[PDB]
Amino acid sequence: PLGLKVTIVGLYLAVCVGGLLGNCLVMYVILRHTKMKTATNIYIFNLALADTLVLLTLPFQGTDILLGFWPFGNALCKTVIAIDYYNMFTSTFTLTAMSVDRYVAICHPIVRTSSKAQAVNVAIWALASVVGVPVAIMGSAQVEDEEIECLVEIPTPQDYWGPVFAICIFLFSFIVPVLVISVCYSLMIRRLRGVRLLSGSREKDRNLRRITRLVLVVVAVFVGCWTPVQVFVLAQGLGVQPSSETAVAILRFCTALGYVNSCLNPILYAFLDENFKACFR
């Protein structure tokens, strides 16, 4: 209703201001402030960049929720949709890259450099483009019934392609990346078992454990924020459509929840990363 969507939009504004502030801070700290351009932090920079873009979309989506239609036209319609998908894919792919980096650090403790991680970020945005660009072409703001709206157009017959795109996007933007991550940390367990102050100098081992913890928590927070949406959107692809005030409300709030993940990221760095913790204040 009117007041409940006022809640949604106010939530967006909060996530928008705090998220842009935090992620811009992080990007600044890594970029110029210090030669702390480590592999993990270059990947973190990638995350903050994607968060920045989607955060920039939050005000526009907010007005759409209020008015009940899209009053910004096709250009910004395709721009927004593109950013959204780019966000999901670059996020999961970057998290996977961080997890593989951690695993290599444990297996080969005795050659990871910012230049290679920068290259990985490039490849991440290229694959993301494989889905980001087509959706931008497909997405449009059209007046199907009663009102104009921004939507991604599913080809005819929708009953076939809907499930196709639903299952494929579900697997490849979510299940498979998370799956790889699971393999990485499980293998790290097998290797780590029975090792105390092993495969390193004392001081370094402690730092490695701290970074591994950080990556793990970031993954956990992300998966926790986007799993409800992922399941619901999958169900929507299969034809399962919400048709009650409560159903719509639940959906709106779970979508919001994922956007909250965008702003959550700098706080996690501030509490679980010593360098960042020093840099805030």
Ligand X SMILES: O=C(NCCCN1CCC(c2c(Cl)cccc2Cl)CC1)[C@H]1CCCN1Cc1ccccc1
Contact residues for ligand OLA, defined by CB under 6 A: 39, 93, 96-97, 100-101, 104, 112, 116-117, 120, 123-124
Distance between CA 40 and CA 100 in Å, rounded?
11
Residue 120 contact among ligand X, ligand OLA, none, beta carbon within 5 to 8 Å by kind: ligand OLA
Nearer to ligand X, 255 or 265 (CB): 255
Does the footprint of ligand X cover residue 255 (CB under 6 A)?
yes
CB 261 within 8 A of CB 255: no
Q: How far is CA 188 from the centre of its chain?
A: 24
Distance between CA 30 and CA 159 in Å, rounded?
47
Task: Please identify, among the stretches 5-13, 78-86, 182-190, 241-249, the one whose residues bind ligand X according to the rule CB under 6 A.
Answer: 78-86
Q: How many CA atoms lie within 13 A of 50 on its CB side?
A: 29
Structure tokens belonging to residue 45 = 């920079």
Does the footprint of ligand X cover residue 173 (CB under 6 A)?
yes
CB 51 within 8 A of CB 94: no
CB 242 within 8 A of CB 248: yes
Nearest residue to 38 (alpha-carbon basis) of 112, 92, 103:
112
Nearer to ligand X, 53 or 214 (CB): 53
Residue 152 contact among ligand OLA, ligand X, none, beta carbon within 5 to 8 Å by kind: ligand X
Does the footprint of ligand X cover residue 230 (CB under 6 A)?
yes
Size of the site for ligand X (CB under 6 A): 16
CB 95 within 8 A of CB 219: yes
CB 35 to ligand OLA: min, Å: 18
Place of tokens 């395709």: 78
Distance between CA 252 and CA 264 in Å, rounded?
19
Nearer to ligand X, 169 or 260 (CB): 169
Distance between CA 129 and CA 17 in Å, rounded?
27
Q: Which of 233, 248, 250, 268 binds ligand X (CB under 6 A)?
A: 233
CB 84 to ligand X: min, Å: 4
Does the footprint of ligand X cover residue 61 (CB under 6 A)?
yes
Task: Please identify, among the stretches 37-45, 46-54, 81-89, 188-196, the one whose residues bind ligand X according to the rule CB under 6 A.
Answer: 81-89
**What is the contact surface with ligand X in residues (CB under 6 A)?**
61, 64, 70, 80-81, 84-85, 88, 150, 152, 169, 173, 229-230, 233, 255
